[PDB]
Each structure stands twice: as structure tokens, then as C-alpha cells.
């Protein structure tokens, strides 16, 4: 098992959800340095060293130094990087048709999440490896309806919409980004 | 065991869309209450406070002064954050109208994920981490009648329900603690 | 069997901050909180009316502390502590949760009604001072009822006639909190019953 | 007469007037710890100690003291607390009817102010008492009108609208707010 | 004459102009401690002591002290307080009528300004008195016009509008409070 | 000549222009201590001591001091005060009339501005005088038009709109206050 | 009679800041000033091109002062001052002030024209360094014209015909300030001529 | 071109100097360009190896960690002889943009396109003397287009249909491309300098 | 070759794009002190001293010095100055005409950018020279269309819109600005 100290990985996309959505609400989740901290632990052997998060674990330790009137492991590597980019439509499209009296239609869009991960050495400060990874996000809407006349009248509508959970594919993106960093480490091999 | 939780912050970076005020977070910031109570009510666990600590510390200074008796710590620590939130994710609905009775039904789903990490104090290594995700159901149903006599007759009835997003977080923050202890079964640290 | 406490206990309640992170929607200004920040008043009056408890204040500490700088200076005499602490926060607020309504119209009389319910949760914690352990904590959750009722008449003569009546009531969210926090201290005291700590 | 040191009572309702009014404009005045003070002054026995406001007086004291090259009274109690809350519509309603060609109608809304005061002992710093007093605020609108045809035409409208002064409705709130605190000192004493 | 040191009186109304007017524009002038400092000056016997403003006079005095290589007058009372509250409609209304073809109508609104003024002693730091005075702000609009057909057509419009100067009424409000503060010192005396 | 130091006079009107205007744009200029300082100097006798502005003058005198390895005149009085208020419509209104087919109309509004200037003694810190002055601001719009038929058609339009320079009536106010500030001093005299 | 200067004068101008407090209206972003902040460039170029005068910098002072720190380090030589000082501000901006336009249409040819005038004001003070007294001050004010003309044709055939032409010009406000500030330096120099200070 | 050799490159920050934000509907707070430089840049130099990026993103976290190591014992840190700096110079659109379309009864069809421009400033600056060795401004372009085709027809009954496709190039990627050629060019200027 | 220390040139025009564009987006890039620096570099002889940018190199020098348990060049001049102005429409206009059934039209807007550069001596701290150079920025639109009836119907549309890349056009301005600053240094000559 190798000790990895990862402090923080910030959303650098600078991108925000469009109207009607709140202009304050980021279009990308800040869950990185959790998603990352777990995905290393799930890739075990790796033993995430916390430091999220350190000043809390530091406050606690004062108390244990106090209550008694015992050391703290470091990592010989470190991981870093950030969320690179997000946008849409990227590549997007759709079709639809209506005849008397039945209409139907379907639309879809893609998005692109990118993540930069870099394994950096602790002692020498040299960046041992860095990779940029990008996944894509699907969304689609489907509708069908009938307008028919009798004399009287008749109509009907059905629809289904699916939007891939941006949080989830970041994870996949930030997962695969872990997979890479390992390959980079194996031929080293450290 | 004695457990000290410091903070779990909303990392979702989301805010409720229009009509809602652009300042309203889409998810409640109340974790480190939800987590503190989920540990207590799942006892054995004994929360160490630390909300909040500076208050308790201010108070201990007062007692000391008028007197002119130590403070219990935790050997593990719980951390993590709210990973993500969104909607519609998967969503949809149907409806139909005949002369003159119409009726229709719609539904939305949301998701929320949380990251809960037990980390050792003494050596500061992360003992375990979990990402748990719940979903949030919303729905609306309506029925109505438009009919003529000659004069007229019409009627409408409807019911709308949104799952209490705060309470799904409770559900979500709960099921993580269960798992976190289950890893603690084979750990054991006990 | 039988329970029993002993005597009064001193409680220091510093702050309960609103964690709901919520603000009324439009037409209301985005700056108006959807929930009052008034807890640690409601909680405090709860404790003083629910005596035997002597809230130690500390709202509020600094103002008293400067005031003690004053008195001491005019003369050229100690300050009571608390044995426990109440803490915790407003867990969250929202709507519509459950909500709905009905209505119907015939010629020419129409009528309708609607209602919404809001869910508030509150978390209160009693934590010991000396050893700093949390003695107990409780999550309590109210709902908030609002409703509207309307009736009207559109009728022709030839000439015309119409009429409208309506009533709208929203339960004062402030009070639900006042009520939420009321049920929260009831509970907390019951564990102190079996405790006692008194 | 007792010396009361009254520092701050802050608006905790966190409420702001809705559209059309500016989103920065509070739904309730911030003026308490004045209204509270004028209550205490005109409610004697009491002698409000200032401390608003303090540094202004504290600075001024340096000037006198310097120009001379003589002490400052205390208060045995402290009055504190906040504005618990505000809201509307709470309860509201109204009616109206129109016949050819005279219509007439009326509406009303009720608003709610709550106030928390607390008397805390200075010497030991224990809370002596606390009071939550909530008044209500009436608003109403009255209208009458006529649309009449001749051929030629005629119409008329008269209307009157009123909202109570929430500034004032707080004054009554804070006035009875003081009453109960005096009483808890009647039985204390 | 009595020396009155007066530092600052803040607008506490928490009130802002509605739409279309800028949401950053106060509903009430920030002019106090001018309107107050001129009021006392015209109310003589009085000698307002500045302190607006003190730091400019304080910097300036370094310059006089440094140019030489002589004392500073203090006051035994102090005036304080704030602008308590503002709002409208309060009382409001209007009427109008239109016949073929002459129309006419008129409307009015009232606004409410309140002021807290306290006289406090500087030596012992006790509030000597405090007063809450209030005035109202009248606005009105009058319109009349003619729409008539001939065959061709004819129309005409006249209108007049007036809004009372909220800045003026505050002066009016901040004035009477001074009249009040004087009395309470007379029977004292 | 008298030495008069004036530090700063701020816009206290608390007012901002309505829509369409940028909500950030102050309805009244922050130009006081420019208009004021010159109204004292242009109406001389008086000798403005700067202090706008003093922080810079003091940085400069550091530079003189450094290259050499000599005093600074003061004022016996000080002027102060600020911009009291601005508003509308105050008094306002207008007329218009149209016949077939020629229309014409005119509209007018007034605004008010007040300014507070106070002469304060330096040595004792007494206020030697205080004055509130008020100007008013005129805005008017005039139009005329013709809609007439032939059968084909005809129409025409003309219009003109004047808004008095709010910046200027601040100046106009800031002078007349200084004018009055001098008069009261003639019976003081302090001059 | 007869006037005369003697030699070049050293001027330090630190800041002349926009005091207009004016912002462009809609459709502009609320954030865009209606006047450039470029004074203390405009002033300085005016003084360098209207030389004899020697702008002393001090914009800017820290960049130069941080740079002198470097040289003095790299070697291990004095700094010229100014004898006068130029100050003052941008006193204001506005519109519409005086504005207007006309137009007419007949079948089917229309035409129209509109125009606005703006007013900028600038205050420039010369204040002596050694004694701190203000030697002189000016308020200068330019105007800024904007105009628009358009003409068109709506005609029928049966088929159809129409046409549109138009031209709009808005004076470069930035420049009027440069013009406003120019006239302000000329006046000042004049009084200096009869002073002389030279 | 070539390695040798390895050169230590310590790159600190390259910040977006375009000062540009997305239009309506998208939030007025959202940048029209990534903040990802000094990631995009650091990985550029590394895949153009030989270069040995020295981190310093990022230095503070590596610094606390070194306090941890040093404390757990109660051992040096490599420097770089050159440095890269600079910024993302500018962004905009329409710049060059256009489109066409035509409809006959009852088939319509149409297409539109827009171009965007991204500029990057990279600089190689010497450490020892603190002198600029080089600076280069490289710019890419970003394509967007929309294609649609549709049918409105009558029978009596009726018929309609619509098909469409839209593509907007990833401004993230173009900047990654810009910064890439930006590095390429920077090599050549060192290729003839040389310092390498 | 003369050593030139170039620090900062800030946008003083205070301009921001109109609606629909965000109210936060400047009408002019902030990238000068790059555009100026590369100008000097390519107008060489000039040896720009960095100082963008200084503190990163300064922090870097703490590392090398300390890695060992070698001096830092000056400049005798300084380039300073600012972006004087930006605006529009300045001059703008356009025409168009339509006959049955062919229409067409064309439009144009011109923008003005101004720049102030200044050379200032270090040793005595005098401004040696200052230049104001102002370019313009061209924007034009072209449309043509056809509406014709048959019975049946026909229509067509073609268009082209170009605005000049103000970023480039700032370089154009900032370049010619160096000409005059070099030129006044010809007769200086320093
Ligand atoms: Hg995905
Ligand atoms: Hg749930
Ligand atoms: Hg309730
Ligand atoms: Hg009332
Ligand atoms: Hg009045
Ligand atoms: Hg005027
Ligand atoms: Hg001009
Ligand atoms: Hg690309
Ligand atoms: Hg250009």
C-alpha cells in the first residue's frame, strides 16, 4: 500500500447553470477531493491520508495532547489537479414528425466534463505524472401526442426525459483519471 | 465509541431555480446535525460536539475565572460532505383528454449523494469512506371536465407532492453511517 | 416506579444558527429569509418559562461583558457559569412537500379552494460542559398550513351580474418554529427525567 | 427608578419587502433600542443608560478630560432580546359585487409582528426574564364604481386604501413588551 | 447658551425606493447631523460643537501644531437618535369620473416619517430625555381630458402632479423634536 | 485673505437614478470639494488649503525630503457640510391638445437640491455658521405632430427636450451658500 | 507691456479620479461607467505635449519604487521631486440636457432625424507643494453631440417596393474629456504667465 | 523536435486575462473561457518532454506535507532554471460568422455557422537573471454550426416534419490546442537560443 | 538593447458589454502587459524585464537559494500607461432595399480604442515620454433574401456578419504605440 496525501482539487471550469436556473449554482459539483479521495481508496492498494480537512484533525489532536496532561503519518507521493472544463451543446441534435393527427418527437444533447489529475512527488516536488481526461454527458426528451376531431374532440400526450447525472460521470471521469495515473506509475515503477 | 465530527459542508454547489430566490441553496446545510444525531441514535456512538466548539470553550473559560475539569477527546473522526444534487435526472408524465373530461399525471426525480469518511485520529489515515446516494420523488396529478349545456359546466381537481429533500438527506446521511459501522465490524477498531 | 429531579440547573445557550439556506421565492425579495433567525430567543424563552432552568444568556455575552467593564471602572463581582449547553440548528425548511386543491364551476356560480404545507425541522442538542460530551439531541419537525377559498358568480340578464368572495390564510411560520422548538425541549427534558444529571 | 443598560435589539425576522419595492428595503424598521428606550423613559420608574451610541460619548469624554489638562454611572440590569419575526399575508381576505352598472368591493390583509425582550441581571449575568409580544397589522382596500351606457356613456370610480404603519405597530408591540417585564419585577422584585 | 456635542444620527428606516427607481436609492435622506446641527444653531441659545467631521478638524490641528515648531472646547450634553421609520401608502386614495366625452380624475397618497431624538448627559452618561416625533408626506395627482367625435375627432389633456419633499418633511420632523427636547430641559431645569 | 481648509463634502442624498438608468449611477455628482473649493477660490478673498488630496501632497513632501540627504501652512477656519437631498417630481405637470389632424403637447418637471455648508472654527471647534441652500431643476419636453388623410396619406413630427444640468444647479447652490456664508461673517466679523 | 516664463517646471500629478458617479443606462451593463477613468494620463500627456512641463509620474509610483529597490539591491541614485501639484477631478457627466429631433413621412417616402447633447465637466487645481496652498483652479465643461438620420420608402405596385437608409454618429466621449482637460491646462498656464511662479 | 537531456520548468500561474463572460441565457457569472491553464499548460510541457514540470500549483499543499514529514522525524527540494508565464490573452465572437437557407413548398432547409477566437500568451523567462527569454502569442479558432431541414405540406389532413443537428466546438479544447502550439513555438525559440 | 521593466497597464475605460452579454464582461481585454511585452520583445532591441509576474519568480528564488544550504538584473527605463478608452457606436450606419420579391440590406458599426503608453526614467523618476494612439474596429452585416409567390410559394435567405477581433485590434493599437515611444527614444537617445 502506498500513502497518498491529497489536499484539494477545485472546480476550475468557472461555468454556471443557465436561465431559468440560479445564476449562483455551479454547473459542476465540488465533490472532488471526495470523489477522488474515495476512488483512490476503492482502487486499493491506496491509503488516502485525509488532509481535507487537516485543521479539524489538528484541533482534535490539541485536546488529546491536553487530556493527557501519538504521531502523524506522511505521504511520499501526492495527488493534485482540478476540474478542467464543462459546456454544451457540444454536439447535440434531434428530430420529430407529426401527421394527422398523431405527433411525435425526440431530442438529445451531449456535454463534456474534463478533469486534470497530477501525481507529484513530495520530497523532490517534481511532477511525476499528469493526465487530462474528458467524459461526456447525454440528455434526451421524447414526446408523443394525438389531436383528433369527431364533432366533440380528442387529444393525448405522453413524454419521457432523461438527463445524465453530471456528478456521476465526473466520478467516472475522475475514476478513469485514477486508472491512468496508475499506468504512469507502473513503468516507473516507484 | 467517542466520535468527533467537525464539519460537513454543502459541496453540491447548487441553488434552487426560478421561481425560487437565487440565494436559496437547493439542499439544506444542516449536516453536522443530521450526522451528529445519526451517530447518537445509532448508539453505541458518543458525539463530541465540535460545532460549536468555540462556544463550549468560551464557557469553560468563564467557569475558570469565577473560581479565581479537563476535556474528553475522540480517537476516531468522521468527515465528508454533500457530494451532489440535481434534477430532473430521469423525469416524465402522461395525460389524456376526451370530451369533455381531461386527466393528467407528471413526476420528477432528483438525486443526492453524500460522502462519509471515518478517519483515524492517532495516525490520521482514512479508515473508510462511503458515497451514498438517495433519490427524491415528486409528482402531480390532475383531473377536469369542460362541458356545454345552453350555460356551461366545468371542474378541476389536483394533488401535488414533493419529497422533503431535507428528509431524503436524512435518509442518505443515515444509510452511510450504517455502512461505516459495518466496515467497522470487520475492522474492527473494537 | 417513580421519577424525580433535584433542583434548578444552569444552561448556557449561545447560538442556534439557521442552516436551512432558504429564501422566499418571487414576488418576495431574494434577500428575505424563508425562515426567521429568531431561535436562541424562542429557545431561551422556552427554557425560562419551562423552569426549573436558568438560562445563562450569552446572546449577548459581549454586551454584558462591556457593561461589566463599566461598573468595575466607576469603583476605582463574579460571573456565574452554566453546567450544560444547548446547541443545534434549524435543520431546514421547504414546500410544497405535500400540497393541493380543488374547484368547480356551474353557470354561473364557481367555487374553488387550495392548500399548501411546509416542512420545518429543528435540531436541538444538550451537551455537557465539564467533559464536553453531548448528553442528548433531538430532531423535531412541524408542517405549515396555508389555504385559499374563492366563490363567484357570472350571470347574464340583458345588464349583467357578478360576484366574488375569498379567504386566504397562511399559518405564521414563525410560530411553527416556536412550536417546533417547544416540542423539542419537552423531549430533551424527558431524557433528563431518566438521567437525571440533576 | 432603576438604571437599565440597553445596548442592542436586532431584527431577526430577516424579512424584506416584496416587489415592486426595492429588494434591499426591510419589512420592519431597525429603530428598536430607541423605541425600546423611549418606552423605558416614559415608563418610569426607569432611567435608560444610553450605551447606543457609547463610543460617541466615550470620545467626547476624552475631549473634556484633555481640556482639563468625572465618572460614569453603571446599570444593575440589562435589557436585551430581538425582533422575533414578521410576516404576511398570514390571515387575509375580502369580498365584492357588481350589478349593472354599479360595482363595489373591499379587501383586507393582516400582518404579524413579534418581539422578544429579556431582562438579564448584570452582577451574576443570569437571565432574569424574557417576553415575547406579538401584535398584528391591518391593511384594507375599499372601492366603488359605475359603468353606465346611454348612447353617450358614463363612468365613475371612488376608492380608499390603507395600511397600518408597521413602524407604529411595533411601537405598541414594544410598549406592551415592556409591561410584562415590569410585572415580572413586581413579583421578583 | 449651552454647548451641544452631536456626533451621528443614522437613517435606521431600512427603507428604499420602489421600482422603477434604483433599488440602491434610500427612501429617506441621510442628511441628519446637518438638519439637526442647523436646527440647534437656529434654535439658539445653542452652540453646536461640530464633531461631524471631528477627524478633519483633528488632522488640521496637527498642521497648526507642526507649524509652530490651542485647546479644544467640550460639551456637557449630547444629542443622539435616528430616523425611525418610513412607509406608504399608509393612508391613500382618490376618485375620478368620466362622462361623454370629458373625463377627469384625482389621486393622493400619504407617507410617514418618524424620528428618535435623545438628549443625553456627557458627565454621568445618563439619558436626560428621548422623543419620538413623526410627520407625514402628501402626494397628489390631478388629470382632466376631452375625447369627442365629430366626423375628424377631438381630444385634450391637462394634468398636474405634486409630491411633498421627503427631505423637507424630515427637516419638519427633525425640527419639532428640537422644540420637544428644549421643553424637557426647561422644567428640569 | 483668509486661509480656509476644506477636507471633504460627501453626497448624502442617498439617491440613485431610476430605470432605464444603471442602478449604480448616483443621481447626484460626488464633485463637491471641487465645486466647493473653487467657489471659495473663484469668489476670493479665500485661499483653499487643498487637503483633498492631502495624502498625495504628503507623499510628494517625502520625496523632497529624501533627495536632500519646509513647513505647511494651516487654516484658521474650516468649511464643511454636505449634499442634503435630491428628488422628484416635487411639483410637476403639463398639457397638450390635438385636433384633426394636428396634435401638440408639452410637459415639465422640477427637481429640488439642497446643500449644507458650515463654517467651523479650528481652534475651539465651535461651528461659526451653518447654512442650508436649495435650488430647483427644470425639465421640459415639447412636441407637435400632424396626422392627415388624402387617399396615400400624410404625417409629420417635431420635438424638443431640455433637462437642466443637475451638476450645474449643484454649483449654483454651492455658490449661493458661500455667498451667504460670507455675509454672516461680515457681522462676525472674524475677517 | 510684455510677459515671459523662464525655465521648465516639475509637475507631480498623483490622481484625478472620476467623481461623475454616472453609469451608462440600459442596454449597457450597469457596470460600465459613462466616463473613462483615463485622466492622469490625459492630464499627463497634455503636460508632456504642452511642454515645457515635466510629468514626474507617480501613478505608478510603486512600480517605479519597487524597481528602484531592485537596482539598489543588484549593486550590493536619488529621486527628483516636483515643485507644483496638479489635482482636481472629473466633476460630472449627463444627458439628455438639451436634445431633440424632427421627421416627416408622406406616401410613401419617410425621413427623420434625432440628436442628443451631453455635458462633461472637469476640475483642475494647481496647488503649490512647499506651502500646500492652492494657487489656482478651473472648472471646464464640454458638450457631446449624438445624431441619427433615416429615410425610407413604402410603395405599392401589385408586387411591392420598400427601402431604408440610415446614418448615426455618437461623438467619442473619451475625447471630449481630452478636449475638456486640454482647455483646462491652457487657462492655468495663462495665470501662471502673469504670476509668474517662473 | 528533440529531448536531450531534461529541463526543469517551474510554472506558477497562467490566468485568464480575457475578462469575458457568457451571454444570456447562461449565467452572467460564468466565464466564457476555462481557468484550466497551469494544468493545460503543465501537461503541455510534460507531453512535449523533455520537460520536468516542478509543480508549484499547489506549492502550499506540498509545503504543509513537508512540515508533516519533517515533524514525523521529530530532505531537499529541486529548483528550476527556467520558468514559463503568461496568460490567456483574449476571446470573442461573432468575429467571422454566417449562414444560409432556402425553402420551397413545402420543403425548407437551412444552415448557420459562427467562429470564435482564442488567444494565448506564453513566455519563457529566465530564473537566474530574471530576464524574459521569449514570449509568444498563439491563437486558435472555434467552429459552431446549426443545420435544419423541414417539411410543411397540406392534403385535406396535413403533414409536417423536422430534422436538425447542431455542433459547437469545445472552447476548452481549442485553448488546449492553442496552448499546445504555443508550447511548440516556444521550443523552437529555445531550439535556437539555446539555453537547452 | 536596453533593459525595460514593464509592470502593469490597466484598463481605464471602464467599459462592459451590453445586453445580451453578461454585465460582468469587459468590452476590452485586460491582456495588455502581455501585448505590450511581446510587442517590445518583437520590436527588439528591447529586453523586457518580466515583472508581470515578479513575485512568482521571487518565490521561486527562495527555493534555489535554500536548495543550496545569483543576482537579479535591473532596467534603466520603465514602460507604463493605460488603456485610455473604448466605445461605440462612434460612427455607424447602414442601408437596404427590397423589391418584389428580392430584398437585401447592409450595415456597419465602427468602434474606437485608445491607448496611452509612457516611458519613464528610473534613476531620476521622470516621465521621458507618453503616447496616445487610437485605432478603430470595423463591423459589417450583409443580408439578401427572396420572397416569391406561385400557387405554392418560395423564399430564400443569405447573410454574412463580421466584427473585427478587438483583442487583435488592441494589439494593432499597442504596436503602433511602441513605434512612437521608440521614436522619441531616437532623438533622446538614451
Ligand atoms: Hg455520464
Ligand atoms: Hg426521501
Ligand atoms: Hg404554526
Ligand atoms: Hg398597531
Ligand atoms: Hg412634511
Ligand atoms: Hg441649474
Ligand atoms: Hg468630442
Ligand atoms: Hg479546437
Ligand atoms: Hg483592428
How many other C-beta atoms lie within 10 A of the C-beta of residue E38?
A: 24
Cell numbers for A47: 491509503
Distance H170 CA to ligand 7 centre (A): 43
- The whole-angstrom separation of Cα D125 and Cα C77 is 10
- The whole-angstrom separation of Cα B59 and Cα C129 is 8
β-bridge mates for residue F119, sequence order: F79, F129
3 state DSSP class of D170: helix
Contacts of D129 in chain C (CB under 8 A): 48
3 state DSSP class of G30: coil
Cell numbers for F146: 400632424
Contacts of I34 in chain H (CB under 8 A): 17, 86-87, 89, 121, 123, 135, 137
First to last CA, chain A: 12
- Length of chain A equals 190
β-bridge mates for residue D159, sequence order: D143, E94
How many other C-beta atoms lie within 10 A of the C-beta of residue H72?
A: 11
- The whole-angstrom separation of Cα A157 and Cα A148 is 12
The dihedral through the CA atoms of I36, I40, I42, I43 has a sign that is positive
Strands I77-80 and I91-99: unpaired
How many other C-beta atoms lie within 10 A of the C-beta of residue G159?
A: 9
Give CA torsion, residues C103, C107, C108, C109, to 10 deg.
Answer: -30
Residue with grid cell 527605463, as numbered in its chain: I77
3-state secondary structure D97-135: EEECCEEEEEEEEEEEEEEEEEEEECCCCCEEEEEEEEE
How many other C-beta atoms lie within 10 A of the C-beta of residue I160?
A: 15
Are B80 and A35 contacting, i.e. CB atoms less than 8 angstroms apart?
Answer: no
Distance C28 CA to ligand 3 centre (A): 20
Interface contact flag, G100 F159, Cβ < 8 Å: yes
3 state DSSP class of G63: helix
From residue F102, give the alpha-carbon distance in Å to each of B143, C34, E158, G105: 57, 56, 17, 14
Distance B131 CA to ligand 1 centre (A): 17
- The whole-angstrom separation of Cα B80 and Cα B83 is 9
- Is residue G107 assigned to a domain? yes
Burial F126-159 (b: 16+ CB within 10 A, else e): bbbbbbbbbbebebebbbbbbeeeeeeeebbbeb
Q: Which candidate, A120, E68, F172, A98, places its Cα nearest to that of H56? A: A120
Q: What contacts E7, CB < 8 A, 6 or more positions away?
A: D56, D59, D60, E33, E51, E52, E54, E78, E80
- Is residue C8 assigned to a domain? yes
DSSP 8-class letter at A17: P
Question: Using alpha carbons only, what angle is made at residue B36 by residues B32 and B40, rounded to the nearest 5 degrees?
Answer: 175
- The whole-angstrom separation of Cα D34 and Cα D38 is 6
Consecutive H or E run containing E170: helix E166-186
Contacts of E19 in chain F (CB under 8 A): 19
- The whole-angstrom separation of Cα B169 and Cα B30 is 9
Contacts of I21 in chain G (CB under 8 A): 29
- The whole-angstrom separation of Cα E172 and Cα E183 is 18
First to last CA, chain H: 12
Are I39 and I63 contacting, i.e. CB atoms less than 8 angstroms apart?
Answer: no
3 state DSSP class of B55: helix
Backbone dihedral angles phi then psi of residue B50, each to the nearest 5 degrees: 65, 50
- Length of chain E equals 189
Contacts of G81 in chain F (CB under 8 A): 60, 63-64, 67
3 state DSSP class of A134: strand
- Is residue H144 assigned to a domain? yes
DSSP 8-class letter at A18: P
Q: Which candidate, A169, A162, C25, places its Cα nearest to that of B84? A: A169
- The whole-angstrom separation of Cα G148 and Cα G165 is 11
From the CA of E23, how many Å to the nearest CA of chain D? 5
Distance G142 CA to ligand 7 centre (A): 8
Q: How many domains, in total, are found in chain E?
A: 1
Radius of gyration of chain I from its Cα atoms, rounded to whole angstroms: 24
Give CA torsion, residues A113, A116, A117, A119, to 10 deg.
Answer: 170
How many other C-beta atoms lie within 10 A of the C-beta of residue F69?
A: 5
- The whole-angstrom separation of Cα B116 and Cα B79 is 6
Q: Which long-range contacts (CB under 8 A, 24 or more apart) does H21-26 make?
A: H21/I21, H21/I22, H21/I24, H21/I25, H22/A15, H22/A16, H22/I22, H23/I20, H23/I21, H23/I22, H24/A19, H24/I19, H24/I20, H24/I21, H24/I22, H25/A18, H25/A19, H26/A16, H26/A18, H26/A19
Give CA torsion, residues D116, D121, D126, D129, to 10 deg.
Answer: -30
3 state DSSP class of I44: coil
What experimental approach yielded this model?
X-ray
From residue D78, give the alpha-carbon distance in Å to each of C60, C62, D126, G31: 10, 12, 10, 47
Are C59 and D119 contacting, i.e. CB atoms less than 8 angstroms apart?
Answer: no
- The whole-angstrom separation of Cα D5 and Cα D51 is 7
Interface contact flag, A89 H166, Cβ < 8 Å: yes
Are C186 and C146 contacting, i.e. CB atoms less than 8 angstroms apart?
Answer: no
Mutation site, F31, F67, F156, F170, interface G, largest G CB count within 10 A = F31
How many other C-beta atoms lie within 10 A of the C-beta of residue H11?
A: 26
Resolution value in angstroms: 3.1
- The whole-angstrom separation of Cα C88 and Cα C125 is 5
Cell numbers for A110: 451531449
Give CA torsion, residues F119, F121, F126, F127, to 10 deg.
Answer: 0
Give CA torsion, residues H194, I2, I3, I6, to 10 deg.
Answer: -110
Contacts of H68 in chain A (CB under 8 A): 5, 72, 74
From the CA of B69, how many Å to the nearest CA of chain A? 10
From residue D118, give the alpha-carbon distance in Å to each of C181, D48, D127: 18, 15, 7
3 state DSSP class of H182: helix
Q: Which candidate, B150, B81, B91, B78, places its Cα nearest to that of B112? A: B81
Residue with grid cell 483633528, as numbered in its chain: E58
- Length of chain I equals 190
Are B29 and B11 contacting, i.e. CB atoms less than 8 angstroms apart?
Answer: no
Chains I and E touch (3+ CB pairs under 8 A): no
Interface contact flag, I38 H78, Cβ < 8 Å: no
- The whole-angstrom separation of Cα A110 and Cα A105 is 18
The dihedral through the CA atoms of A183, A184, A186, A187 has a sign that is positive
Ramachandran assignment for G37, one of left (phi > 0), alpha (psi -120 to 50 degrees), beta (any other): alpha
> Which ligand sits closest to the CA of H169?
8
Distance G173 CA to ligand 7 centre (A): 6
Q: Which candidate, D150, F102, F94, F160, places its Cα nearest to that of E145? A: F94
Chains that touch H (3 or more CB pairs under 8 A): A, I
β-bridge mates for residue H108, sequence order: H103, H150
Domain region containing C49: 1-59+80-198
3 state DSSP class of B54: helix
Contacts of I73 in chain H (CB under 8 A): 129-131
Report how many Cβ contacts below 8 Å link chain E to chain F.
173
Distance F180 CA to ligand 7 centre (A): 37
Strands H8-11 and H82-92: parallel
DSSP D33-88: TTHHHHHHHHTSS-EE---SSHHHHHHHHHHHHHHT-------SEEEE--B-EEES
From residue C96, give the alpha-carbon distance in Å to each of B31, B162, C117, C141, E95: 22, 6, 6, 15, 41
3 state DSSP class of H183: helix
Which of G48, G63, G168 lies nearest to residue I92, judging by beta carbons?
Answer: G168
DSSP F93-124: EEEEEEESEEEEEEEEEEEEEEEEEEEEESSS
- The whole-angstrom separation of Cα F117 and Cα F120 is 10
Cell numbers for B141: 396529478
Q: Which candidate, D29, D28, D30, D39, places its Cα nearest to that of D6? A: D39
Residues whose CB is under 5 A from ligand 4 (ion)?
Answer: D 169, 172
Q: Which candidate, H41, G72, H83, H64, places its Cα nearest to that of I61? A: H83
How many other C-beta atoms lie within 10 A of the C-beta of residue C175?
A: 21
Q: What contacts A91, CB < 8 A, 6 or more positions away?
A: A110, H166, H167, H168
- The whole-angstrom separation of Cα H40 and Cα H62 is 20
- Is residue C133 assigned to a domain? yes
Mutation site, G14, G26, G67, interface I, largest I CB count within 10 A = G67
Are A9 and A81 contacting, i.e. CB atoms less than 8 angstroms apart?
Answer: yes
Interface contact flag, E73 F99, Cβ < 8 Å: no
- Is residue G183 assigned to a domain? yes
**In chain G, where do the E strands start and end?**
10-12, 54-55, 84-92, 98-106, 108-128, 134-156, 160-170
- The whole-angstrom separation of Cα G121 and Cα F38 is 13
3 state DSSP class of H187: helix
Backbone dihedral angles phi then psi of residue B3, each to the nearest 5 degrees: -125, 125
3 state DSSP class of E159: strand
Give CA torsion, residues A26, A31, A33, A35, to 10 deg.
Answer: -140
Q: What contacts E32, CB < 8 A, 6 or more positions away?
A: E8, E9, E10, E11, E82, E83, E170, E174
**In chain H, where do the E strands start and end?**
8-11, 52-53, 82-92, 96-104, 106-126, 132-154, 158-168
Amino acid at each position: 500500500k502506498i500513502f497518498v496525501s491529497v489536499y484539494n482539487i477545485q472546480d476550475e471550469t468557472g461555468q454556471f447553470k443557465p436561465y431559468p436556473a440560479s445564476n449562483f449554482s455551479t454547473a459542476v459539483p465540488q465533490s472532488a477531493t471526495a470523489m477522488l479521495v474515495t476512488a483512490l481508496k476503492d482502487s486499493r492498494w491506496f491509503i488516502p491520508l485525509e488532509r481535507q480537512g487537516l485543521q479539524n484533525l489538528l484541533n482534535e489532536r490539541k485536546i488529546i495532547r491536553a487530556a493527557q496532561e501519538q504521531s502523524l503519518t506522511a505521504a511520499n507521493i501526492m495527488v493534485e489537479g482540478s476540474i478542467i472544463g464543462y459546456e454544451s451543446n457540444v454536439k447535440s441534435g434531434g428530430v420529430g414528425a407529426r401527421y394527422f393527427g398523431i405527433g411525435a418527437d425526440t431530442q438529445y444533447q451531449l456535454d463534456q466534463i474534463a478533469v486534470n489529475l497530477r501525481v507529484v512527488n513530495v520530497s523532490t516536488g517534481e511532477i511525476l505524472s499528469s493526465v487530462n481526461t474528458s467524459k461526456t454527458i447525454l440528455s434526451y426528451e421524447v414526446q408523443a401526442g394525438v389531436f383528433r376531431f369527431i364533432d366533440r374532440l380528442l387529444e393525448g400526450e405522453v413524454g419521457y426525459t432523461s438527463n445524465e447525472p453530471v456528478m456521476l460521470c465526473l466520478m467516472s471521469a475522475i475514476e478513469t483519471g485514477v486508472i491512468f495515473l496508475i499506468n504512469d506509475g507502473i513503468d516507473r515503477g516507484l
